[PDB]
Symmetry: D2
């Protein structure tokens, strides 16, 4: 029953700031606590970000984006296993196993996340 | 105001069947109608699937998976622009701009989808 | 979970266009002409137990990445069957460069020359040897 | 395509992709990545091409087997980038997660020895790629 979980960073774990002072992006401390609890329990935590794909481009993420992001995540005390970049950008993903951070936090608060059932058509 | 949308195929547009007779996968006709309406209105429709990644493997999706999928989508009368494969598999994606098909259908039924706002931390 | 592999099996990746077949600007893809020598050489390696992957950029500029699955793959796969090519894997969305400089790369002319002499399987890749 | 025209400038900019390991630097099994030794002739050649206006992309498989794809960003990139800075390499793009094959057979591929040879002779920029010529 160990889950394989994928989290956005921006406007999810931290809040976007248009000043783009990335190392100082502000955490949602409730998200950090919840992810850390899941990490401690033995779930796999992957972070996946589109950051930089439009601003510096795919060839520059490694140099120009990753240092400040990784440092931010350390400063806010986030535990995670995997960090993946080059996420594509859509206005919406419609996905049977997707959840927004508000629902995630609500379920974690109630202790209901680990057994929460994903969508099925049930035709 | 034109949206860039990404949809799962399995257990989203169609229902999974363990017999893996892919061409005969059953459509959620409400999903098909909703997607077609968005297509007709000018939104970009991308389908993104993990199908085959575990069963035939990434080198075989092009040969062994795509033909029956494309035929199924034609038989059900789905309109779409883009079809992408090799989707990674997670138990959950936690994403500020994600939605499950039930919420998608509910919003489309009400005429609220196009202006529905994505999640922000609002710290 | 033991997978069977010939001892000294090679994992090989081949371009399709201007490699296995010749480009034609008419873009009648199903009728692209094969280099029969390439087809024979690849088939020989397939028969010996090597893994054959085909990797193509076809369509990336003409129809775009979202359309390759629908508009490019059928005629390509049919072409490869018609020319009698044996292979294991087919991958798309290859990036486009004027040159890849790579320690384990070879152009089709060298590939054919080595295969003619029976020297391909043991041919050594580049090392700096500084 | 008249020489010196915009079209000519554009056509003469090449889009180049280089391996890092056993190409720009030499592999060492000790995996002390920051101290990997440069082929100074490769560094000079790439820097010359960078200065002349060509696009320089580096592409590496490093880490894919040792730490895995989820860890390359954290565990592999810092020491690689530092190495490339210490050796004085100029480049535009750095890409990871390269797949591994024993050989790529490709109409537009060249090994570092041929690359260096052509650069030494001033013949790289106009060197023609392979065509079947059936
Ligand atoms: Mg799904
Ligand atoms: Mg997001
Ligand atoms: Mg290499
Ligand atoms: Mg090619």
């Amino acid at each position: 029953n160990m889950l394989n979980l994928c989290f956005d960073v921006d406007d999810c774990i931290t809040e976007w700031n248009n000043n783009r002072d990335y190392v100082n992006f502000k955490p949602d401390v409730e998200m950090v606590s919840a992810i850390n609890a899941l990490y401690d329990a033995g779930h796999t935590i992957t972070l996946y970000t589109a950051r930089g794909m439009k601003s510096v481009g795919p060839g520059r993420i490694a140099i120009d984006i990753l240092p400040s992001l990784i440092q931010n995540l350390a400063n806010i005390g986030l535990k995670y296993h995997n960090l993946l970049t080059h996420k594509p950008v859509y206005d919406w993903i419609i996905d049977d196993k997707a959840m927004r951070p508000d629902e995630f936090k609500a379920l974690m608060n109630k202790g209901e996340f680990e057994t929460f059932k994903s969508y099925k058509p049930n035709l």
